[PDB]
Amino acid sequence: LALEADLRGAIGRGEITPYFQPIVRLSTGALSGFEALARWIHPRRGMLPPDEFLPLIEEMGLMSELGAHMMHAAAQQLSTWRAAHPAMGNLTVSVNLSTGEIDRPGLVADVAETLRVNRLPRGALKLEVTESDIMRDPERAAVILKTLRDAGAGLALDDFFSSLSYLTRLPFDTLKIDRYFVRTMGNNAGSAKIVRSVVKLGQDLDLEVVAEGVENAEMAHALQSLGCDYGQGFGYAPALSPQEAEVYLNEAYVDG
Ligand SMILES: [K+]
Ligand SMILES: [K+]
């Protein structure tokens, strides 16, 4: 079909769907939650990661349709896991709050409905927000992010002077360190300085910190020594299909 129709169909049929990457407490290895990550199970091209299809969605103005679909799928999966394990702690699932959603009237009601129909505890679903999303309109971000916390969503600042100022106002609970910095910190002093800076801020200002792109034990151990709370990456597990994530969860030690 035409591009917009093809993408609306792939989203609506769930061809574009979440895989789930474990987020672990670095000091113990215990599972804290998962990140919901979009994949296109493309019928002709095979599985495609976001970097190979998101530009199409952006061009067609479909970020809200993709984001909604991802948030619904992520929340439903968490709900299923909660029902299966009624004594389990507050296992989280993070998902990107897609660009433009902060501006969309009706985001808050959607989030609230999603939390409540899935019976999710406060903070079980965490929404990831970037600096560039905030920068579109910081005033609207301050209103809407506060209201999302009142609805029961958690909030992470992904890819964490502008950001220091935004942090003072906005009710984030989690900071994420970009994989580039983690992967280059061993060999690049400036990347190590940035990693250390984010970790130290979280410790000083009581925000949790997630390192992305943790590839191996050397990297994990370096982050453990700094006191970074959490990690995700190939050193622990890739993004997993729902079926694989279920197995991972059932075999896991859960944080807390
Ligand atoms: K935790
Ligand atoms: K992300």
XYZ file of N, CA and C and ligand atoms in Angstrom:
770
model
N 0.862 -1.224 0.000
C 0.000 0.000 0.000
C 0.876 1.244 0.000
N 0.271 2.433 0.046
C 1.010 3.702 0.291
C 1.703 3.648 1.637
N 2.799 4.389 1.775
C 3.618 4.287 2.927
C 2.857 4.484 4.247
N 2.031 5.512 4.332
C 1.335 5.760 5.588
C 0.426 4.576 5.942
N -0.243 4.017 4.935
C -1.141 2.862 5.125
C -0.356 1.625 5.522
N 0.787 1.387 4.890
C 1.633 0.259 5.225
C 2.038 0.353 6.689
N 2.470 1.537 7.143
C 2.926 1.672 8.510
C 1.765 1.586 9.493
N 0.637 2.193 9.165
C -0.511 2.065 10.067
C -0.931 0.618 10.209
N -0.818 -0.145 9.141
C -1.149 -1.572 9.166
C -0.158 -2.376 9.976
N 1.128 -2.115 9.819
C 2.139 -2.861 10.532
C 1.978 -2.594 12.025
N 1.722 -1.333 12.406
C 1.518 -0.979 13.816
C 0.244 -1.650 14.323
N -0.854 -1.497 13.586
C -2.175 -1.975 14.041
C -2.219 -3.483 14.141
N -1.551 -4.211 13.258
C -1.503 -5.673 13.325
C -0.485 -6.204 14.302
N 0.376 -5.325 14.840
C 1.380 -5.768 15.772
C 2.563 -6.419 15.099
N 2.818 -6.076 13.840
C 4.092 -6.438 13.162
C 5.245 -5.672 13.797
N 4.962 -4.451 14.187
C 5.869 -3.658 15.010
C 5.424 -3.935 16.414
N 6.331 -4.465 17.229
C 5.988 -5.021 18.513
C 7.199 -4.962 19.459
N 6.959 -4.980 20.784
C 8.095 -4.894 21.691
C 8.833 -6.203 21.919
N 10.161 -6.114 21.942
C 11.018 -7.100 22.594
C 11.432 -6.482 23.917
N 11.996 -7.272 24.810
C 12.154 -6.874 26.242
C 13.554 -7.163 26.677
N 14.324 -6.116 26.987
C 15.711 -6.315 27.385
C 15.834 -6.191 28.901
N 16.392 -7.213 29.589
C 16.578 -7.132 31.035
C 17.423 -5.916 31.465
N 16.995 -5.321 32.576
C 17.721 -4.277 33.322
C 18.024 -4.891 34.669
N 19.304 -4.975 35.021
C 19.767 -5.677 36.232
C 20.408 -4.718 37.213
N 20.324 -5.042 38.500
C 21.137 -4.369 39.524
C 22.564 -4.851 39.357
N 23.512 -3.952 39.130
C 24.861 -4.340 38.792
C 25.532 -5.102 39.929
N 25.293 -4.696 41.153
C 26.015 -5.306 42.271
C 25.651 -6.776 42.523
N 24.434 -7.185 42.154
C 23.929 -8.510 42.449
C 23.623 -9.306 41.183
N 23.407 -8.647 40.053
C 22.876 -9.339 38.921
C 21.385 -9.540 38.898
N 20.675 -9.095 39.928
C 19.214 -9.374 40.072
C 18.423 -8.580 39.062
N 17.359 -9.170 38.549
C 16.514 -8.549 37.571
C 15.659 -7.487 38.221
N 15.747 -6.258 37.739
C 14.914 -5.160 38.211
C 13.690 -4.857 37.340
N 13.858 -5.105 36.049
C 12.815 -4.815 35.070
C 13.299 -5.089 33.672
N 12.520 -4.629 32.712
C 12.859 -4.787 31.311
C 12.639 -3.467 30.602
N 13.385 -3.217 29.553
C 13.081 -2.146 28.602
C 12.336 -2.757 27.410
N 11.174 -2.185 27.093
C 10.394 -2.528 25.891
C 10.985 -1.796 24.726
N 11.424 -2.515 23.704
C 12.160 -2.003 22.549
C 11.450 -2.413 21.265
N 11.157 -1.458 20.402
C 10.387 -1.732 19.216
C 11.171 -2.594 18.212
N 10.524 -3.581 17.626
C 11.070 -4.356 16.535
C 10.005 -4.471 15.464
N 10.387 -4.353 14.211
C 9.487 -4.674 13.079
C 9.780 -6.054 12.580
N 8.865 -6.994 12.831
C 8.945 -8.330 12.265
C 8.414 -8.149 10.843
N 9.285 -7.749 9.947
C 8.834 -7.297 8.615
C 8.608 -8.537 7.779
N 7.477 -8.614 7.052
C 7.141 -9.844 6.349
C 8.047 -10.178 5.185
N 8.772 -9.205 4.637
C 9.705 -9.430 3.544
C 11.160 -9.182 3.926
N 11.398 -8.301 4.884
C 12.767 -7.843 5.186
C 13.353 -8.481 6.442
N 12.557 -9.259 7.156
C 13.009 -9.849 8.405
C 12.911 -8.891 9.559
N 13.425 -9.284 10.726
C 13.341 -8.387 11.882
C 14.216 -7.178 11.591
N 13.653 -6.010 11.874
C 14.291 -4.693 11.746
C 14.277 -3.941 13.054
N 15.428 -3.387 13.434
C 15.466 -2.559 14.604
C 15.021 -1.128 14.282
N 14.710 -0.295 15.290
C 14.223 1.031 15.068
C 15.068 1.895 14.181
N 16.386 1.758 14.281
C 17.253 2.576 13.458
C 17.049 2.324 11.941
N 16.410 1.206 11.573
C 16.080 0.859 10.174
C 14.589 1.077 9.763
N 13.783 1.641 10.622
C 12.421 2.001 10.231
C 11.809 3.231 10.858
N 12.368 3.675 11.979
C 11.794 4.850 12.618
C 11.735 6.110 11.749
N 12.741 6.344 10.884
C 12.613 7.502 10.019
C 11.318 7.534 9.169
N 10.815 6.362 8.777
C 9.591 6.262 7.986
C 8.396 6.685 8.814
N 8.347 6.179 10.039
C 7.289 6.565 10.972
C 7.310 8.089 11.234
N 8.509 8.622 11.445
C 8.658 10.073 11.640
C 8.181 10.857 10.449
N 8.573 10.432 9.268
C 8.208 11.157 8.071
C 6.698 11.207 7.896
N 6.023 10.111 8.226
C 4.584 10.022 8.074
C 3.789 10.583 9.237
N 4.470 11.089 10.257
C 3.771 11.675 11.386
C 3.060 10.653 12.262
N 3.615 9.426 12.392
C 2.952 8.345 13.125
C 3.586 8.007 14.461
N 4.334 8.928 15.050
C 4.996 8.668 16.331
C 4.033 8.402 17.466
N 2.887 9.070 17.468
C 1.883 8.853 18.519
C 1.232 7.479 18.391
N 0.991 7.015 17.162
C 0.395 5.700 16.961
C 1.378 4.588 17.341
N 2.632 4.771 16.986
C 3.642 3.784 17.393
C 3.788 3.787 18.923
N 3.930 4.970 19.505
C 4.144 5.095 20.953
C 3.030 4.521 21.761
N 1.799 4.807 21.383
C 0.660 4.279 22.071
C 0.707 2.767 22.046
N 0.940 2.200 20.851
C 0.934 0.779 20.669
C 2.010 0.111 21.549
N 3.196 0.704 21.565
C 4.274 0.179 22.398
C 3.953 0.240 23.882
N 3.408 1.358 24.330
C 3.071 1.518 25.743
C 1.980 0.527 26.151
N 0.960 0.319 25.319
C -0.085 -0.641 25.610
C 0.460 -2.061 25.694
N 1.304 -2.405 24.722
C 1.878 -3.768 24.680
C 2.801 -3.985 25.889
N 3.584 -2.978 26.248
C 4.503 -3.114 27.387
C 3.743 -3.289 28.693
N 2.703 -2.490 28.899
C 1.883 -2.559 30.094
C 1.117 -3.897 30.198
N 0.587 -4.375 29.082
C -0.127 -5.636 29.063
C 0.837 -6.766 29.439
N 2.050 -6.762 28.894
C 3.008 -7.818 29.238
C 3.363 -7.792 30.709
N 3.571 -6.611 31.267
C 3.851 -6.530 32.692
C 2.687 -7.045 33.525
N 1.477 -6.716 33.099
C 0.280 -7.151 33.798
C 0.206 -8.674 33.835
N 0.485 -9.288 32.694
C 0.514 -10.780 32.564
C 1.544 -11.365 33.500
N 2.722 -10.807 33.540
C 3.742 -11.303 34.460
C 3.360 -11.118 35.928
N 2.723 -9.999 36.254
C 2.278 -9.747 37.621
C 1.235 -10.769 38.074
N 0.301 -11.090 37.184
C -0.763 -12.033 37.481
C -0.173 -13.409 37.701
N 0.819 -13.781 36.927
C 1.476 -15.092 37.060
C 2.286 -15.215 38.324
N 2.751 -14.102 38.881
C 3.653 -14.112 40.046
C 3.133 -13.149 41.099
N 2.069 -13.529 41.820
C 1.388 -12.533 42.675
C 2.189 -12.027 43.886
N 3.226 -12.747 44.327
C 4.081 -12.301 45.427
C 5.318 -11.527 44.958
N 5.497 -11.343 43.663
C 6.650 -10.678 43.153
C 6.586 -9.174 43.452
N 7.772 -8.607 43.627
C 7.967 -7.184 43.821
C 7.653 -6.352 42.589
N 7.995 -5.079 42.641
C 7.592 -4.104 41.622
C 8.566 -4.132 40.438
N 8.571 -5.239 39.707
C 9.292 -5.385 38.462
C 8.829 -4.304 37.504
N 9.758 -3.566 36.921
C 9.381 -2.456 36.066
C 9.439 -2.854 34.585
N 8.734 -2.078 33.778
C 8.951 -2.089 32.341
C 9.005 -0.653 31.871
N 10.128 -0.334 31.232
C 10.336 0.987 30.660
C 9.976 0.997 29.192
N 9.531 2.150 28.722
C 9.227 2.304 27.326
C 9.445 3.734 26.914
N 9.848 3.952 25.677
C 9.989 5.303 25.177
C 8.646 6.014 25.124
N 8.600 7.228 25.623
C 7.464 8.137 25.395
C 7.818 8.835 24.070
N 7.126 8.507 22.994
C 7.619 8.941 21.709
C 7.501 10.443 21.568
N 8.389 10.979 20.754
C 8.443 12.408 20.477
C 7.099 12.921 19.987
N 6.668 14.038 20.548
C 5.377 14.619 20.289
C 4.295 14.247 21.276
N 4.467 13.152 22.021
C 3.428 12.748 22.940
C 3.146 13.737 24.058
N 4.193 14.379 24.558
C 4.002 15.388 25.580
C 3.024 16.490 25.147
N 3.044 16.815 23.851
C 2.136 17.830 23.290
C 0.710 17.326 23.072
N 0.512 16.019 23.006
C -0.793 15.465 22.574
C -1.776 15.527 23.753
N -2.849 16.289 23.639
C -3.823 16.301 24.723
C -4.446 14.977 24.788
N -4.649 14.424 25.955
C -5.141 13.025 25.933
C -4.067 11.978 26.231
N -2.782 12.305 26.140
C -1.734 11.429 26.674
C -1.989 11.012 28.113
N -2.279 11.951 28.977
C -2.416 11.612 30.401
C -3.549 10.623 30.614
N -4.705 10.890 30.010
C -5.834 9.968 30.183
C -5.491 8.569 29.641
N -4.757 8.500 28.544
C -4.331 7.213 27.974
C -3.421 6.470 28.953
N -2.433 7.174 29.483
C -1.530 6.554 30.442
C -2.296 6.088 31.644
N -3.124 6.933 32.236
C -3.895 6.527 33.379
C -4.757 5.319 33.110
N -5.456 5.284 31.993
C -6.262 4.128 31.625
C -5.414 2.883 31.479
N -4.258 2.999 30.854
C -3.359 1.870 30.671
C -2.891 1.329 32.015
N -2.540 2.203 32.950
C -2.108 1.737 34.278
C -3.234 1.043 34.998
N -4.406 1.590 34.890
C -5.463 1.140 35.767
C -6.081 -0.138 35.211
N -6.290 -0.251 33.903
C -6.852 -1.486 33.324
C -5.909 -2.689 33.421
N -4.611 -2.415 33.536
C -3.586 -3.432 33.782
C -3.232 -3.620 35.255
N -3.937 -2.927 36.146
C -3.683 -2.968 37.561
C -2.239 -2.788 37.986
N -1.531 -1.837 37.368
C -0.129 -1.652 37.627
C 0.136 -0.734 38.831
N 1.028 -1.135 39.719
C 1.413 -0.296 40.872
C 2.067 0.992 40.417
N 2.131 1.966 41.325
C 2.833 3.200 41.067
C 4.244 2.836 40.693
N 4.758 3.478 39.648
C 6.114 3.281 39.225
C 6.430 1.989 38.468
N 5.463 1.121 38.255
C 5.721 -0.144 37.524
C 6.051 0.131 36.052
N 5.360 1.074 35.433
C 5.622 1.467 34.056
C 6.399 2.743 34.066
N 7.586 2.726 33.482
C 8.411 3.907 33.428
C 8.444 4.404 31.993
N 8.281 5.709 31.861
C 8.314 6.363 30.560
C 9.645 7.066 30.399
N 10.278 6.832 29.257
C 11.571 7.420 28.937
C 11.364 8.656 28.105
N 12.070 9.717 28.489
C 11.948 11.018 27.832
C 13.347 11.504 27.501
N 13.523 12.113 26.346
C 14.824 12.672 26.008
C 14.873 14.176 26.265
N 16.093 14.686 26.318
C 16.302 16.117 26.401
C 15.705 16.861 25.230
N 15.865 16.340 24.026
C 15.341 17.029 22.851
C 13.816 17.087 22.871
N 13.173 16.093 23.491
C 11.726 16.124 23.665
C 11.312 17.242 24.613
N 12.048 17.383 25.693
C 11.772 18.453 26.656
C 11.928 19.848 26.011
N 12.998 19.957 25.225
C 13.402 21.200 24.609
C 12.395 21.723 23.620
N 11.548 20.849 23.045
C 10.440 21.279 22.182
C 9.582 22.284 22.922
N 9.336 22.032 24.203
C 8.523 22.929 25.013
C 8.641 22.562 26.485
N 9.626 23.147 27.159
C 9.872 22.831 28.559
C 8.715 23.131 29.497
N 7.962 24.201 29.236
C 6.787 24.468 30.048
C 5.708 23.392 29.998
N 5.395 22.922 28.794
C 4.445 21.838 28.637
C 5.017 20.571 29.299
N 6.314 20.305 29.135
C 6.912 19.145 29.778
C 6.734 19.196 31.290
N 6.911 20.371 31.895
C 6.788 20.465 33.344
C 5.382 20.127 33.787
N 4.362 20.625 33.070
C 2.966 20.338 33.420
C 2.665 18.831 33.277
N 2.970 18.315 32.089
C 2.555 16.950 31.727
C 3.344 15.922 32.513
N 4.665 16.107 32.681
C 5.418 15.112 33.456
C 5.005 15.056 34.901
N 4.719 16.201 35.502
C 4.145 16.191 36.853
C 2.820 15.394 36.896
N 1.953 15.656 35.925
C 0.655 14.945 35.870
C 0.818 13.463 35.622
N 1.792 13.062 34.829
C 2.062 11.637 34.659
C 2.539 10.961 35.945
N 3.337 11.640 36.739
C 3.682 11.076 38.037
C 2.415 10.938 38.893
N 1.536 11.937 38.884
C 0.277 11.808 39.633
C -0.596 10.644 39.166
N -0.479 10.291 37.904
C -1.195 9.138 37.347
C -0.573 7.820 37.798
N 0.668 7.826 38.270
C 1.351 6.610 38.639
C 2.438 6.130 37.710
N 2.843 6.903 36.690
C 3.955 6.487 35.838
C 5.268 6.892 36.479
N 6.280 6.091 36.288
C 7.653 6.484 36.528
C 8.236 7.223 35.343
N 9.363 7.882 35.545
C 9.946 8.765 34.519
C 11.452 8.636 34.516
N 12.014 8.353 33.343
C 13.467 8.280 33.150
C 13.909 9.269 32.099
N 15.044 9.922 32.356
C 15.646 10.833 31.383
C 16.698 10.074 30.620
N 16.441 9.817 29.367
C 17.242 8.905 28.562
C 18.306 9.777 27.981
N 19.488 9.190 27.750
C 20.616 9.875 27.107
C 20.972 11.119 27.889
N 21.117 10.967 29.198
C 21.419 12.075 30.110
C 22.920 12.404 30.057
N 24.575 22.016 29.597
C 23.915 22.639 30.735
C 22.383 22.453 30.774
N 21.774 22.212 29.605
C 20.318 22.203 29.503
C 19.715 21.124 30.410
N 20.314 19.950 30.401
C 19.782 18.832 31.149
C 19.893 19.009 32.658
N 20.933 19.638 33.155
C 21.015 19.916 34.585
C 19.871 20.813 35.058
N 19.557 21.851 34.283
C 18.441 22.735 34.605
C 17.105 22.000 34.539
N 16.886 21.245 33.471
C 15.622 20.502 33.318
C 15.392 19.557 34.509
N 16.463 18.906 34.958
C 16.378 17.965 36.053
C 15.845 18.626 37.314
N 16.270 19.857 37.598
C 15.834 20.527 38.822
C 14.325 20.694 38.828
N 13.728 20.894 37.685
C 12.288 21.157 37.632
C 11.489 19.874 37.509
N 11.960 18.949 36.683
C 11.125 17.847 36.197
C 11.276 16.642 37.099
N 10.195 15.914 37.396
C 10.190 14.883 38.385
C 10.661 13.518 37.898
N 11.861 13.507 37.359
C 12.470 12.246 36.973
C 12.887 11.431 38.182
N 12.797 10.113 38.094
C 13.304 9.210 39.134
C 14.590 8.482 38.721
N 14.898 8.481 37.423
C 15.973 7.637 36.822
C 16.657 8.449 35.732
N 17.972 8.287 35.662
C 18.824 8.783 34.623
C 19.437 7.644 33.859
N 19.521 7.714 32.560
C 20.209 6.696 31.771
C 21.451 7.220 31.119
N 22.518 6.443 31.131
C 23.782 6.782 30.496
C 23.822 6.158 29.118
N 24.058 6.940 28.087
C 24.117 6.473 26.752
C 25.204 5.431 26.541
N 24.900 4.405 25.769
C 25.830 3.311 25.486
C 27.154 3.756 24.920
N 27.173 4.821 24.139
C 28.446 5.293 23.588
C 29.454 5.601 24.699
N 28.989 6.257 25.751
C 29.894 6.641 26.839
C 30.371 5.396 27.586
N 29.464 4.464 27.870
C 29.812 3.237 28.545
C 30.835 2.441 27.756
N 30.618 2.337 26.449
C 31.462 1.509 25.591
C 32.843 2.109 25.344
N 32.958 3.422 25.507
C 34.232 4.125 25.251
C 34.948 4.546 26.535
N 34.355 4.353 27.710
C 34.964 4.836 28.939
C 36.301 4.221 29.276
N 36.532 2.988 28.829
C 37.805 2.260 29.101
C 38.983 2.894 28.404
N 38.725 3.528 27.266
C 39.760 4.009 26.368
C 39.735 5.527 26.147
N 38.762 6.250 26.694
C 38.489 7.649 26.446
C 38.138 8.347 27.751
N 39.058 9.167 28.230
C 38.958 9.774 29.544
C 37.785 10.691 29.649
N 37.400 11.344 28.572
C 36.266 12.224 28.595
C 34.975 11.452 28.743
N 34.879 10.300 28.098
C 33.704 9.431 28.317
C 33.656 8.918 29.738
N 34.804 8.551 30.299
C 34.819 8.115 31.703
C 34.350 9.256 32.608
N 34.759 10.488 32.324
C 34.381 11.629 33.125
C 32.860 11.823 33.074
N 32.256 11.681 31.889
C 30.801 11.801 31.778
C 30.078 10.698 32.571
N 30.544 9.446 32.428
C 29.936 8.324 33.197
C 29.991 8.628 34.699
N 31.173 8.993 35.167
C 31.324 9.305 36.580
C 30.420 10.441 37.049
N 30.303 11.460 36.217
C 29.475 12.622 36.512
C 28.002 12.249 36.657
N 27.488 11.414 35.761
C 26.102 10.994 35.880
C 25.878 10.137 37.106
N 26.793 9.222 37.370
C 26.647 8.403 38.545
C 26.665 9.226 39.810
N 27.611 10.149 39.894
C 27.764 10.930 41.124
C 26.540 11.775 41.360
N 26.012 12.400 40.318
C 24.737 13.124 40.434
C 23.595 12.265 40.958
N 23.394 11.103 40.367
C 22.356 10.246 40.930
C 22.562 9.963 42.414
N 23.795 9.703 42.854
C 24.037 9.399 44.270
C 23.762 10.603 45.152
N 24.135 11.792 44.682
C 23.971 13.039 45.450
C 22.523 13.512 45.544
N 21.773 13.261 44.483
C 20.432 13.763 44.331
C 19.386 12.649 44.344
N 19.795 11.463 44.845
C 18.940 10.334 45.071
C 18.067 10.032 43.855
N 18.713 9.886 42.696
C 18.077 9.329 41.494
C 18.817 8.099 41.045
N 18.057 7.108 40.606
C 18.695 5.873 40.174
C 19.310 6.083 38.810
N 20.340 5.298 38.498
C 21.089 5.449 37.235
C 21.161 4.074 36.553
N 20.828 4.055 35.273
C 20.914 2.872 34.432
C 21.990 3.103 33.382
N 23.021 2.288 33.347
C 24.012 2.271 32.251
C 23.516 1.412 31.102
N 23.483 1.949 29.894
C 23.151 1.214 28.707
C 24.378 0.684 28.012
N 24.187 -0.387 27.275
C 25.192 -0.903 26.408
C 26.335 -1.603 27.122
N 26.073 -2.179 28.291
C 27.065 -2.938 29.052
C 27.367 -4.268 28.357
N 28.522 -4.362 27.700
C 28.855 -5.464 26.796
C 29.499 -6.645 27.447
N 30.150 -6.476 28.592
C 31.018 -7.514 29.142
C 31.288 -7.242 30.602
N 32.023 -8.149 31.240
C 32.308 -8.074 32.652
C 33.205 -6.918 33.005
N 34.166 -6.556 32.162
C 35.048 -5.426 32.437
C 34.199 -4.149 32.640
N 33.256 -3.924 31.729
C 32.417 -2.760 31.783
C 31.524 -2.811 32.991
N 30.930 -3.978 33.239
C 30.043 -4.114 34.399
C 30.784 -3.835 35.693
N 32.005 -4.356 35.799
C 32.776 -4.190 37.023
C 33.191 -2.738 37.242
N 33.518 -2.047 36.157
C 33.909 -0.626 36.231
C 32.704 0.165 36.752
N 31.502 -0.146 36.272
C 30.290 0.579 36.701
C 29.918 0.217 38.119
N 30.085 -1.044 38.508
C 29.879 -1.502 39.888
C 30.765 -0.674 40.813
N 32.011 -0.467 40.439
C 32.966 0.238 41.342
C 32.581 1.696 41.556
N 31.928 2.290 40.568
C 31.426 3.682 40.683
C 30.125 3.768 41.485
N 29.480 2.644 41.714
C 28.189 2.604 42.394
C 27.009 2.829 41.481
N 27.172 2.675 40.164
C 26.019 2.776 39.235
C 24.965 1.727 39.625
N 23.669 2.055 39.697
C 22.688 1.130 40.240
C 22.432 -0.013 39.277
N 22.110 0.272 38.031
C 21.598 -0.696 37.103
C 22.350 -0.704 35.808
N 22.226 -1.793 35.071
C 22.821 -1.925 33.750
C 21.918 -2.716 32.836
N 22.122 -2.512 31.543
C 21.505 -3.302 30.501
C 22.531 -3.419 29.382
N 22.490 -4.532 28.664
C 23.334 -4.708 27.497
C 23.600 -6.156 27.235
N 24.389 -6.381 26.203
C 24.671 -7.720 25.741
C 25.384 -8.583 26.768
N 26.088 -7.964 27.714
C 26.761 -8.707 28.774
C 25.768 -9.459 29.653
N 24.519 -9.016 29.690
C 23.469 -9.642 30.497
C 22.480 -10.385 29.614
N 21.880 -9.688 28.649
C 20.951 -10.283 27.672
C 20.581 -9.240 26.627
N 20.359 -9.671 25.395
C 19.838 -8.781 24.384
C 18.359 -8.473 24.622
N 17.746 -7.669 23.778
C 16.308 -7.625 23.723
C 15.750 -9.012 23.376
N 14.835 -9.491 24.210
C 14.281 -10.850 24.138
C 12.861 -10.813 23.596
N 12.461 -11.843 22.830
C 11.064 -11.996 22.471
C 10.260 -12.187 23.738
N 8.951 -11.980 23.663
C 8.147 -12.226 24.869
C 8.345 -13.625 25.444
N 8.493 -14.616 24.582
C 8.622 -15.983 25.021
C 9.963 -16.185 25.738
N 11.029 -15.661 25.139
C 12.357 -15.701 25.743
C 12.412 -14.902 27.064
N 11.725 -13.771 27.117
C 11.704 -12.903 28.334
C 10.988 -13.627 29.472
N 9.941 -14.365 29.155
C 9.215 -15.189 30.118
C 10.149 -16.213 30.739
N 10.935 -16.901 29.919
C 11.874 -17.882 30.429
C 12.904 -17.193 31.308
N 13.419 -16.044 30.859
C 14.442 -15.299 31.597
C 13.865 -14.940 32.977
N 12.652 -14.404 33.020
C 12.005 -14.010 34.285
C 11.845 -15.205 35.207
N 11.378 -16.333 34.675
C 11.110 -17.479 35.544
C 12.379 -18.063 36.159
N 13.506 -17.879 35.482
C 14.815 -18.328 35.968
C 15.591 -17.320 36.764
N 15.042 -16.123 36.882
C 15.753 -15.026 37.490
C 15.633 -14.950 38.992
N 16.599 -14.275 39.591
C 16.476 -13.702 40.918
C 15.981 -12.272 40.732
N 14.859 -11.891 41.325
C 14.274 -10.571 41.157
C 14.820 -9.626 42.220
N 15.203 -8.427 41.797
C 15.775 -7.412 42.682
C 14.817 -7.114 43.814
N 15.325 -7.149 45.039
C 14.504 -6.859 46.209
C 13.924 -8.120 46.807
K 14.504 -2.134 41.577
K 15.492 4.175 25.127
